[PDB]
Ligand binder design. Structure first.
Ligand SMILES: Nc1ncnc2c1ncn2[C@@H]1O[C@H](CSCC[C@H](N)C(=O)O)[C@@H](O)[C@H]1O
Ligand SMILES: Nc1ncnc2c1ncn2[C@@H]1O[C@H](CSCC[C@H](N)C(=O)O)[C@@H](O)[C@H]1O
Ligand SMILES: N[C@@H](Cc1ccc(O)cc1)C(=O)O
Ligand SMILES: N[C@@H](Cc1ccc(O)cc1)C(=O)O
Lengths: 378, 361
């Protein structure tokens, strides 16, 4: 395994045993600090691009990158301990190198590059995380007391959106399998709305899966520019378009067969979330679906599965950057009901869940009239 | 258990599938940032002390700590997701609390408290880690160009030493078993020298195991004070002494049956390490042992075990704070030989190895 503690050497019976064992486990969690520090320093120094160009021992890489030889040995061996880089052995020793899969993740400009995540950490998240205590003290509530949506800004997303492309393929595969099993097909026309599309990868992969479909991505102008470039890269530009502007305005159009919200709801407040859900219902075809892809957990907020654990942690990442949450199934169901929609599927993905919702079929149990309206206003 | 990625849902072996899997695995390693941030913020806010005093729902704890109620729920549920705090969920809602073992680790002033580690990260390590690239560029070198020893200062050790007490019990029990299997018994007297003793816990646990032994700890003034107070709490004060000051000034003594270096050699340069080893040999009694407890790896520097993997990372933690290393078995053997010592044993512990050496002549 990749454990940093040999737990076979820790006992666990007495009160002291158990305190010592817990302390080792907490220490292992604390030194998780070191991995982003090592990986992001290596990015700043040019290590990954250099190894991809020419595998080298630590002294040669230090020469090429104008670094100290011993410190570079320390850095590269740490990356090796994290399984981030590999070794190739010669008759006289070894060189460090990147596997093909690691190259895709670590170099700039690739489809699944994490560089935008490295830069988001360096520029935004690292300094924020050290100030977490002050943000918990004060909250995300504005001066008037109202909560704020998440504070990651468009200039920050210019780096970050490409750094989260890696999430998309498993999600789109799972979504497409369900769409096909429920009767959808790529040989008939259909329209997708991708709200806050980022690079557009989710709808672009859908376009590749369903060759007669079209997609419209909503985002701010500087991100829409990225999305159109990526649509061309993936060969789907004839069926992908963007509409720039603030998606909270609504008026998204008509007749959409699928409205996708990937990594959007966690940025919202409850008020902004229900408004978005209402905009989605307003633009949906009669038989259309809304797909929510997010960090979603039951109201019990128990860390049972990896997706549950990640969701609980992701809520802290949202608080760290100024607002949002990891919302519960029951909160999404409130919002679906408020928008005249009904959840019909929940699907697991590596770090997310997908909720699918359709237009509701049955009426409220309270009939139309002033009593219903007073309940609505309250 | 700990995983944040459902790897069962990352399938296939096409080039794309492998790249996506790797990206998820690298992302999971990057978000390890979040755990110390959550834990250390909770410490700063007084969360652990408040939960120990009275379990609480999140809204009550927010009122007690003058924090935002929703943000407190988020923080507490993250701590629960990390298995750091406990939480009961019943028809009355959620209540957060500490287990007995977590209380020992998370509150100040306990024997195994990690508070000193929290404070070391907040005050020293976290700002340094953000600047790691600069130290790699320039090297852990002094103005003359020579390798520098680690830079953590004595005032920083005043917090940190109590925060690493948790390492000691597994190490001392392993060491004690090997000393007893080596004919060293209770009821026979022996003298221990604990070089850079920190809180003195390694010595003090040996004193509890071997009731006729005595131990002398070498450390700086303010840490010797901590070590004596802890010996008193552990009931071994009559057999534990300290010799306060820079151990490079000497005044170590002679006739020691055991000379212990726990978490010392990784702070050294090769030049300072060989000098320390020679000093140790000179103070040994006949049949005395030197015990090195450290992050030790083969020269191949392969992460074949947890201890090897941790050692390679610990070398980066040393570089981060200005010098030192995780040295190799081969380097220790060179230093032993230069000092007239010979390695006789290597013992594994949860995050370290123990090397034992004795005089060859
Ligand atoms: N009010 C708003 N109007 C338009 N775009 C917005 C917005 N608030 C957030 N966004 C966009 O929403 C995106 C959130 S990041 C998620 C991007 C993409 N859906 C993916 O999952 O990879 C960013 O691209 C950001 O620019
Ligand atoms: N030159 C020196 N003289 C005296 N003490 C020193 C020293 N250099 C380092 N130390 C001490 O060495 C210790 C390193 S931390 C390890 C402490 C203890 N052996 C443990 O393993 O828990 C600190 O207490 C520090 O103050
Ligand atoms: N919080 C994530 C980044 C992120 C932000 C917004 C999103 O919509 C998605 C991902 C991180 O720091 O790793
Ligand atoms: N480098 C360790 C702390 C440490 C420092 C010096 C030591 O001798 C031992 C431990 C950490 O940051 O977790």
């Amino acid at each position: 395994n990749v454990s940093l503690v040999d737990e076979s050497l820790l006992v666990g019976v007495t009160d002291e045993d158990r305190a010592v064992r817990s302390a080792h486990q907490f220490y292992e969690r604390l030194i998780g600090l070191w991995a982003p520090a090592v990986m992001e320093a290596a990015h700043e120094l040019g290590v990954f691009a250099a190894l991809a160009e020419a595998p080298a021992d630590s002294g040669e890489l230090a020469r090429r990158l104008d670094c100290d030889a011993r410190a570079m040995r320390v850095l590269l061996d740490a990356l090796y301990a994290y399984d981030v880089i590999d070794r190739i052995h010669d008759t006289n020793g070894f060189r460090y190198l990147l596997s093909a899969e690691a190259r895709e993740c670590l170099l700039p400009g690739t489809l699944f590059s994490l560089v935008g995540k490295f830069m988001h950490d360096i520029n935004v998240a690292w300094p924020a995380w050290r100030n977490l205590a002050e943000v918990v003290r004060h909250g995300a509530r504005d001066t008037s007391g109202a909560e704020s949506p998440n504070g990651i800004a468009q200039e920050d997303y210019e780096s970050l959106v490409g750094g989260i492309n890696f999430w998309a393929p498993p999600i789109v595969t799972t979504l497409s399998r369900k769409l096909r099993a429920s009767g959808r097909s790529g040989d008939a026309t259909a329209s997708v709305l991708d709200v806050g599309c980022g690079t557009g990868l989710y709808s672009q992969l859908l376009l590749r899966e369903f060759p007669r479909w079209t997609a419209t991505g909503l985002d701010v102008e500087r991100i829409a520019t990225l999305a159109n470039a990526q649509a061309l890269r993936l060969g789907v530009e004839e069926r992908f378009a963007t509409r720039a502007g603030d998606f909270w305005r609504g008026g998204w159009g008509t007749g959409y067969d699928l409205v996708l919200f990937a990594n959007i709801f966690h940025l919202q407040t409850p008020a902004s979330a229900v408004r978005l859900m209402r905009h989605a219902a307003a633009c949906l075809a009669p038989d259309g679906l809304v797909a929510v892809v997010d960090q979603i957990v039951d109201a019990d907020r128990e860390p049972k599965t990896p997706q549950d654990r990640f969701a609980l942690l992701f809520a802290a990442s949202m608080t760290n950057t100024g607002g949002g949450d990891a919302y519960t199934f029951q909160e999404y169901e409130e919002w679906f009901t408020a928008a005249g929609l009904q959840r019909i599927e929940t699907l697991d993905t590596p770090m997310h869940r997908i909720l699918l919702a359709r237009r509701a079929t049955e009426p409220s149990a309270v009939p139309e009239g002033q009593a219903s309206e007073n309940l609505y206003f309250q």
